[PDB]
Design a protein around this nucleic acid. Structure first.
Lengths: 155, 260, 188, 119
RNA sequence: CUCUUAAGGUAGCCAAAUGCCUCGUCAUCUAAUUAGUGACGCGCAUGAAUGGAUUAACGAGAUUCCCACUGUCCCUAUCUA
RNA sequence: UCUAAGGGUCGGGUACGAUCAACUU
RNA sequence: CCGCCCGUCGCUAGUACCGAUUGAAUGGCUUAGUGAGGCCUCAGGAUCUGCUUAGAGAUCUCAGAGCGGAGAAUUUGGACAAACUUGGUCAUUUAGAGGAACUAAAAGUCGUAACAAGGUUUCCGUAGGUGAACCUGCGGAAGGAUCAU
RNA sequence: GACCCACUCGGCACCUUACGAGAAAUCAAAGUCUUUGGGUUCUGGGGGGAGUAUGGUCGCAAGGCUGAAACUUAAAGGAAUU
RNA sequence: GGUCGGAUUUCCAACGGGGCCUUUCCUUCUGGCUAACCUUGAGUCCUUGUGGCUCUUGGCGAACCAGGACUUUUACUUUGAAAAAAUUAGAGUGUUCAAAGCAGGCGUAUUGCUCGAAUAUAUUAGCAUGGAAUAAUAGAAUAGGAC
RNA sequence: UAUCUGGUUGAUCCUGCCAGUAGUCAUAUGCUUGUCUCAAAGAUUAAGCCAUGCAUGUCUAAGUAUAAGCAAUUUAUACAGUGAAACUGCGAAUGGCUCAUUAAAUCAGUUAUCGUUUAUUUGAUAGUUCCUUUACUACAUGGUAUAACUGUGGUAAUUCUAGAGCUAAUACAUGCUUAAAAUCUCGACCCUUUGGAAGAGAUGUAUUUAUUAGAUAAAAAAUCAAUGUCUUCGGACUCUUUGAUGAUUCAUAAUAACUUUUCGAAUCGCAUGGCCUUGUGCUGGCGAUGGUUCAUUCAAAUUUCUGCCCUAUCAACUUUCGAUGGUAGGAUAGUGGCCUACCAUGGUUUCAACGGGUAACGGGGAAUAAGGGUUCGAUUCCGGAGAGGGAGCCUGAGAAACGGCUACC
């Protein structure tokens, strides 16, 4: 996905200080850097095999996940490499000894190692600030569909 | 704001100095030093308030400006010098070597020790790094850098320091079956022989401890400090041995202990 | 001055925030200088903690790395157009990080000739021993070997001259070099 | 770091009768003194109420109840025959006033009146 | 209460292009206003398809004020054909 | 004095190239 | 029941509303214009000064000339931007001929609408009309004066 | 098919009583509520001013929906009793 | 009450935990200690009914931790840590009582001894932990399902 | 100490308010006032602000003292006692005061910096620098100014100052003196096929860039470019160097160079000793101050999650000349639309957005309550702000400082 083909931008997109010498005829032609983000988050094969760059990625980029780990439902996918998740919770009012539903919306950066869709549940981790509003990054996905595509096929 | 605070008011000072609050005014702010502001004890407090050798700050200064008192083999004529845990204070008057340790209620127990025991102190290694030119160093809880130690000294172990040469004589690892002296927390001043450890990656490693009375409890590993093996401490322990006799036992004692 | 702060912006909801603090030197921003070519002129600015920064104006030389061979050489640098950055703070046809520049190529030519015994474009026992030993490597690339004819090499600046005061960089080689000249349409 | 409080209905002749009887019996100049003893007694009573709501063989109950009982015994309000944390609730202003010194002077002799004792 | 009419001027409107007395009275607009506007109304002689009251838009229609602008004027002088 | 954007006709061994010409912003 | 009670009108006092006056005052925010100051930058170079062959018996000049170094006034451009002016906008107070309500007083005037079948049963909605209460029409209710052939 | 008897589901209601409920009038719900909690929506907080003024909105209009304050007042009101 | 109003063993019972077996996996993979062990080597100063102090070399993985694998998600509740100090409640104590304060008490007071300055609460959010009812959620139906 | 009473009526039961009642570290005021202890106090109205009059600087044995100042050391002819001034260095950014603005913003608790600065403390930590590196030199330690001071003056006046003459420094500016060994390159030379060589230069630390190493769960064999330490040159081949984190492009090290070139004591006080080749010879103690980097400490700046009053007679806001994100750059101590270039069109909202109001600083906490709760919180702790309003900035580790400058009002 992401159809940057790899180099959609006017600058050359590369991993910094990752040098593929044209002299040495290595039989891979594929030098990448990835890391284990940690905390038992699995580094995807899309990240290891892919061609994207995404400096804000927690696997191939320079950010680091540290602090909190949260979960939420994707309620928007209309930006580029970032989403908005809904974080629903119940707030207690003691006067009434009861609860009330509350939500906070939380913008999140998503690598192109993840195919994220509205409705999917997604686990995110605290990163350094990478935009005005974004402080979190997608680190795991759980699609709540089962690939239920043929259920629409009815005849 | 606009730079660091130089003052400290009575009521803001840690509760384990025991002075007085309501417009009693100011308290002694520990100067920057090896120990933290709250987990420390200045000499003015150690001398005016605990030992009663002095009555006033000018008396304490008159003491300190005579090379009488030294912390860790060094004089420290500063009034608000932050002395801390496992620090050795040496007065040639009475030849009294004072170790600062914790009683069970969390105050600073005034432990008197022998000169042979004052020869050394102990230190919990906080980090182990390589310095410049590939020289490994360990940092203790008292801000002491020690170069080229044994390579088996990993983090949270404790170390025996000779206090005249800042060198390492022997180290004790962090493992089960090792004594512990809790520093910091609700359970401050307790001594309880590590049962086991709870990892929690990214999440404040916890430690499960068991007193001699089989009173199990739990603390944070940043607050744990090892001191020896089962029943063989490396320091003279204070009166109480870190047991925390409950209030009921305490009244039973001080009613049946003594009619005075 | 220039507040490098967010309390002035707006809320993410679109809410207009109130002016809440007089500006703070914590939140400080400063004015660039348009690092041009020619006649080295470096002004030092005092920063937080002392910590001199070296604001370069009008550099002429730079230190450029040839990494397939693993060396670095000083050269003089050449034309520029940048940036696609600014309108407010920097002004005029500058030189900056990530900029593509032409450099002298003569120290690299000399080094290559003395290190491989081989020319580009178009003796003693020790030298012959060395050249024969480290031969089978002077085969770089059509593009770089063609640049050496003109005697001007495409390189990228990797240093930030308005922070450090230098024009260090690396010579373009490979997929970068294949990529780059379809771009550089900019002033300011 | 300060304390005291007073009653609710400013009249109610039965209270006035009782209060003035206590004042005449024990040599008092004010209703504030009876109010003070009632205040102390109220603090005691509500403490013991909370402890009795707690479980038996509960450590806070044992500790604070034995302490309160010990204090009242050594003052002599609570007789040493009744030491069970229910006569603490059954106590009364007469039982405190009887342990006041003025009253103790008179009852021990030595003054031939409570007013002479106060003087 | 009384006389009287075919009916006795209704809703509404007004010193209005309709009000004599009249430069009506009160307010506003001005330093000052027979002007203007708003209100008042036993209205010489207002008034309902001889249409009444109102009305956005339109007007080489009549009219008042404000800003800008000016030889209209203070106060005239000069140039060109 | 420059920059950018906005098009036509031909080519696909069953992602893009060659060539041509307007004015508008 | 010689009980209770409605409204108009009129006198008095008070409260708020409408209202010509493109009303007035105050304050906040702001477009546009002008724009101090310092900061960065392009220049500038009074002045001082090291060295050097130079003008001059053997930590020194006597015409002068180059290599420089520090460097004030002044000055270009830029960002930061006070303040002022002009408009606009919002809010809050406030005047105002006259108009229209409310409340309260007061042994006021005209009637007597409701409470008994209140002397036309009352009330609701709507519409019209009348000095005032009110009346009338249409449909509805009984909180009816009928729980009933 | 219509009637009669018995039963049944679902409806409009009715007669009797209070084990209860209620201020009472009365209520098989207005009960199962100080032995206070089956689920859920709407509305009221003394009487007047006032469902007025103002602003919005709907409407051709008539008007509807929404909806104050100042000010005033110790009673207004509900069932029953003689 | 066997010592002189305090305690003890087997006790008739109750209340709460843990483990195992009943079709019941109540997570495993690479390992140590292999341990609580077929390890039994001659075995015992005991009311033979086990109230029970005692050894000779060689078994099953959590009782010790190293890593791993995958590990449905929550809410709820217990425990703990977190919970600034003063204040609040509250223990002790001669401020001459009390409000207060954190002091002070004991000797042969002829050159000293010593108790202390507790403790609790502090809703919500977050952290760890045991439970697993109640209430949601997922878990193999055009089998891409499990071992 | 979980309490109620008077008032609608001819009387009754209700609804329902009014009134009473108690408290208030809640204020004011009135009357009265003998004592002891404890004691708040120009917050409310004018963040008008006190509009008067007074105050934060500082020295030791140990930076610089020819005071034309004192006394006198009587241990001294260079000082060497004390010590005004002034230079230097630290500090004045703390404290104290107030609550104007402020409604996810402060703030509370809870996180994080693998996203940065940090004077001072505390502990560690510079044989590498004579740049023609055999005269080039002072390394028994080199240069210049200037204050205070002397004296001439200006102005009505201010913590105004000019001109002239001296002189100092852990001021300013410069600047050498301490290894040995190894590894690298260059390489005269002699030469080989196995090729080996004498000389020259570089290798501290800091800055900038590029590159590299920074490993790793386990077992037997063929081939080769060169065999490689050593060889039975059959190939025995083992030996092997690699730290930490949950996680890194981490720490660290090594290559190539780069810098207008940082740091690597021209400093100070007491004690005066040890060894001889007895020279004012060589060695040597206890400290002070200063200094690079690392770590620690005091901090600071940003930051995660949740949480705040009243209003719908505020329902649609944001993006205009940044609103949301992306790429790149600039700036910053650092992250980041912080700022802009290009690009895309997003982001918040009936789970109350945005707007308005607050007689709104936030909390810890206070008052009153059976329990639940309502109200208050200008304050004696904590942290945010502000110094008449605005804005800007110097110095410094730290200020957008006001008992510091600049301007406008």
């Amino acid at each position: 996905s992401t159809e940057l083909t790899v180099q959609s931008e006017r600058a050359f997109q590369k991993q910094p200080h990752i040098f593929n010498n044209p002299k040495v005829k290595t039989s891979k032609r594929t030098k990448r850097w990835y890391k284990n983000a940690g905390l038992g988050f699995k580094t995807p094969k899309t990240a290891i095999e892919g061609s994207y760059i995404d400096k804000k990625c927690p696997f191939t980029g320079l950010v680091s996940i540290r602090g909190k780990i949260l979960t939420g439902t994707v309620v928007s996918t209309k930006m580029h490499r970032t989403i908005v998740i809904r974080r629903a919770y119940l707030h207690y009012i003691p006067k009434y000894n009861r609860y009330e539903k509350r939500h906070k919306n939380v913008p999140v950066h998503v690598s192109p190692a993840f195919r994220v869709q509205v409705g999917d549940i997604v686990t995110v981790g605290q990163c350094r600030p990478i935009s005005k509003t974004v402080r979190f990054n997608v680190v795991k996905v759980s699609a709540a569909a089962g690939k239920a595509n043929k259920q629409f096929a009815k005849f | 704001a606009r730079g660091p605070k130089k003052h400290l008011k009575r009521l803001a000072a840690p509760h384990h100095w025991l002075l007085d609050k309501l417009s009693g005014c100011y308290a002694p702010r520990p100067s920057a030093g090896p120990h933290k502001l709250r987990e420390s004890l200045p000499l003015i407090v150690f001398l005016r308030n605990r030992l009663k050798y002095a009555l006033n700050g000018r008396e304490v200064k008159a003491i300190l400006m005579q090379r009488h008192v030294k912390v860790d083999g060094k004089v420290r004529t500063d009034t608000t010098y932050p002395a801390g845990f496992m620090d050795v204070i040496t007065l040639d008057a009475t030849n009294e070597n004072f170790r600062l340790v914790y009683d069970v209620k969390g105050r600073f127990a005034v432990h008197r020790i022998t000169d042979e025991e004052a020869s050394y102190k102990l230190g919990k290694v906080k980090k182990v790094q390589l310095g410049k030119k590939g020289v490994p160093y360990v940092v203790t809880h008292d801000g002491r850098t020690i170069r080229y130690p044994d390579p088996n000294i990993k983090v949270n172990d404790t170390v025996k320091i000779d206090l005249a040469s800042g060198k390492i004589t022997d180290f004790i690892k962090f493992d089960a079956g090792k004594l512990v002296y809790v520093t910091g927390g609700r359970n401050l001043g307790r001594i309880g022989t590590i049962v086991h450890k709870e990892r929690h990656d990214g999440g404040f490693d916890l430690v499960h401890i068991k007193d001699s009375l089989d009173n199990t409890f739990v603390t944070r590993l940043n607050n744990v400090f090892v001191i020896g093996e089962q029943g063989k401490p490396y320091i003279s322990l204070p009166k109480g041995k870190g047991i925390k006799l409950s209030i009921a036992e305490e009244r039973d004692r001080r009613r049946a202990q003594q009619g005075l | 001055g220039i507040s490098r702060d967010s309390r002035h912006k707006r809320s993410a909801t679109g809410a207009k925030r109130a002016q809440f603090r007089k500006k703070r030197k914590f939140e400080l921003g400063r004015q660039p200088a348009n690092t041009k070519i020619g006649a080295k002129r470096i002004h030092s600015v005092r920063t937080r903690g002392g910590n001199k920064k070296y604001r370069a104006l009008r550099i002429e030389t730079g230190n450029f790395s040839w990494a397939s061979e693993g060396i670095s050489k000083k050269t003089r640098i050449a034309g520029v157009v940048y940036h696609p950055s600014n309108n407010e703070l920097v002004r005029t046809n500058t030189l900056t990080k990530a900029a593509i520049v032409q450099i002298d190529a003569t120290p690299f030519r000399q080094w290559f000739e003395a290190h491989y015994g081989q020319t580009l474009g178009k003796k003693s026992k020790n030298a012959e021993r060395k050249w024969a030993a480290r031969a089978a490597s002077a085969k770089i690339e059509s593009s770089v070997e063609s640049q050496f004819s003109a005697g001007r090499l495409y390189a990228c600046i990797s240093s930030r001259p308005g922070q450090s005061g230098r024009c260090d960089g690396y010579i373009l080689e490979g997929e970068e070099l294949a990529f780059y000249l379809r771009r550089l349409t900019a002033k300011k | 770091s300060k304390t005291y409080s007073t009653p609710k209905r400013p009249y109610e002749s039965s209270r006035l009768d009782a209060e003035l009887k206590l004042a005449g019996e024990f040599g008092l100049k004010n209703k504030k003194e009876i109010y003070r003893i009632s205040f102390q007694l109220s603090k005691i009573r509500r403490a013991a109420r909370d402890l009795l709501t707690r479980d038996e063989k509960d450590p806070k109950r044992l500790f604070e109840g034995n302490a309160l009982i010990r204090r009242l015994v050594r003052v002599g309000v609570l007789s040493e025959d009744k030491k069970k944390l229910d006569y603490v609730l059954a106590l009364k202003v007469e039982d405190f006033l009887e342990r006041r010194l003025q009253t103790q002077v008179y009852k021990l002799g030595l003054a031939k009146s409570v007013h002479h004792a106060r003087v």
